[PDB]
Design brief:
homodimer; 7-stranded antiparallel β-sheet; main proteinase (3clpro) structure, domain 3; alpha+beta; Thrombin, subunit H; 3 domains; binds the ligand *C(=N)[C@H](C[C@@H]1CCNC1=O)NC(=O)[C@@H]1[C@@H]2[C@H](CN1C(=O)[C@@H](NC(=O)C(F)(F)F)C(C)(C)C)C2(C)C
Chain lengths: 305, 303
């Protein structure tokens, strides 16, 4: 038993991380097959970033301006392309450690593991969620660009995030692996802000199911409620509305604990109305919302890769 | 910027996880060179665990009783010995993925990454601290035995933990890689007690420095205190006493923020006495204590 914020094993992704140097700039790249993916502002000087013309900057660059190093090895670039906000550099060598992989674009509320990297070396791994405002509450210093987020399906690595920049209040923004930003953000050093963030309700319900499975039950109440009554309250407290699709996703957890989803919604309703009164749930004094219903099932059943 | 509970990359340890089968029982092993390490209760039946005599139970096992699978391929066991609470199985194949490694016994308050495994296959990775009562707060199901905790020093993997059992309160107990338990626990299915846990004060101060570095400053004050003043306060709240050595460990953080270790202690004392007034620090409503002063320096300066 117990319940922890848990990241996927990073081994498969570590084997794809490389260093990309263009000029003075040094950041991280993702080496899959004979293509290396990295953020396109690697071609930028600190002056360029205030308002870059990427198309102009890139055409001026030749293949030999891009240094790709995979540990001790040095990869020879034989092609460079730009797709949205990522540079694609073709290399003379296919990554022999390329795992089974997809490129996916996740919806808000879905979680993933981030492998934080600097100079192409993995530094650490942690778990995060795509916030409803399309930011992620991460941990990134200068030089972390190109660190990627991923999910693992048995042996297939679904890459969903590449890191680019930090927004006001210390939140983070980036792209899918096709270079399209999550949210209304641009890779320019200009005034941007994320927008009001909301709590991921279906994940809070999943986390409450993790608690019950682990013995924390003091919050279960005798009441119940309709889906529309719950959502009326939840939007009052800046919680995302619960949809019928969210109810079905919670089915497995509902059938394990014999607690109807709408019964659990009533417990949550009272938690937002009467506060937690200094009490804790699975050790936390706040309601946790970065566990998906799938995360909870995985951790409580022992799924492996 | 930002601050997260962060684990070491688990790749080097993934290549050392094998499945160990002995009769009906299955659990995880750690394959280093031509040796596999696993908890010794892999030799117990359902009944044996209530009161095992491991010497006698092992005497009735043979090398051919132990089936080690590494991915698909089965390994050949050619020798076995018992070192305290772990079995050491010699195999006919050195692990070609063996990293540079050492075995260490960690102190309370130190942190490490756990690679949680089932049937020799990794399930997930998370960070935890050795509690002062020599338990850890983990996530462990049946079959998780033989999962290991570890730190990475550049390229060397320091193994410090192998998981054995779960205690009544849902916390978890295990051994170092020589098989000596952390704490006063035994590998037997009988009611056991962890004892009173305390807060790792020097880690809480490290977390507060992480907060100040990340712009969350509302808890700072120009108040002061002595180490004896603070420690007299801290013990009332079940906080481990702060030593001068802890003050020396916190030095790099103090110098990076320009806040004396003891000014920060005066802020922690104020926090324990007055609560948080519903405030949060780094988005947390409670004081976090599983970040060491080294962890904070690493994450906030990018090692
Ligand atoms: C990658 N090398 C860094 C990683 C950043 C820096 C600090 N923390 C991180 O995650 N990325 C940047 O330096 C990018 C890079 C130019 C500016 N930038 C920023 O992250 C800046 N942010 C913004 O301009 C804002 F707020 F709009 F996001 C900075 C103020 C330096 C944090 C480019 C191309 C965006
Ligand atoms: C080995 N894979 C399991 C892992 C446990 C089971 C649930 N979570 C875990 O971390 N470990 C065991 O089953 C060990 C094994 C016999 C009993 N045991 C326990 O963990 C038991 N605990 C205790 O008896 C107590 F209270 F002392 F901790 C159990 C009640 C099954 C949790 C042996 C040899 C210790």
């Amino acid at each position: 038993s117990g319940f922890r914020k848990m990241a996927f094993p990073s081994g498969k992704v570590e084997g794809c991380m490389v260093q990309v140097i263009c000029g003075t700039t040094t950041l991280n790249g993702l080496w899959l097959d004979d293509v290396v993916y990295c953020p396109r502002h690697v071609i930028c000087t600190s002056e360029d970033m205030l308002n870059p013309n990427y198309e102009d900057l890139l055409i001026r660059k030749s293949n030999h301006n891009f240094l790709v190093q995979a540990g001790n090895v040095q990869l020879r670039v034989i092609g460079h392309s730009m797709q949205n906000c990522v540079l694609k550099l073709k290399v003379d060598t296919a990554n022999p450690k390329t795992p089974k992989y997809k490129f996916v674009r996740i919806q808000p509320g879905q979680t993933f593991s981030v492998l934080a990297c600097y100079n192409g070396s993995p530094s650490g791994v942690y778990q995060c969620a795509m916030r409803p405002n399309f930011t992620i509450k991460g941990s990134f210093l200068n030089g972390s660009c190109g660190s990627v987020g991923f999910n693992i399906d048995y042996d297939c690595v679904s890459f969903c995030y590449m890191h680019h920049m930090e927004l006001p209040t210390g939140v983070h923004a980036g792209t899918d692996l096709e270079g399209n930003f999550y949210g209304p953000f641009v890779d320019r050093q200009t005034a941007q802000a994320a927008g009001t963030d909301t709590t991921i309700t279906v994940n809070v319900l999943a986390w409450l199911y993790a608690a019950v499975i682990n013995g924390d039950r003091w919050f279960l109440n005798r009441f119940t409620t309709t889906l529309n009554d719950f959502n009326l309250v939840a939007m009052k407290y800046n919680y995302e509305p619960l949809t019928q699709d969210h109810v079905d996703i919670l089915g497995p957890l509902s059938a394990q604990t014999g607690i109807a989803v709408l019964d659990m919604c009533a417990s949550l309703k009272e938690l937002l109305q009467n506060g937690m009164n200094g009490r804790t749930i699975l050790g936390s004094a706040l309601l946790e919302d970065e566990f998906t219903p799938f995360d909870v099932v995985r951790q409580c059943s022992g799924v492996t890769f």
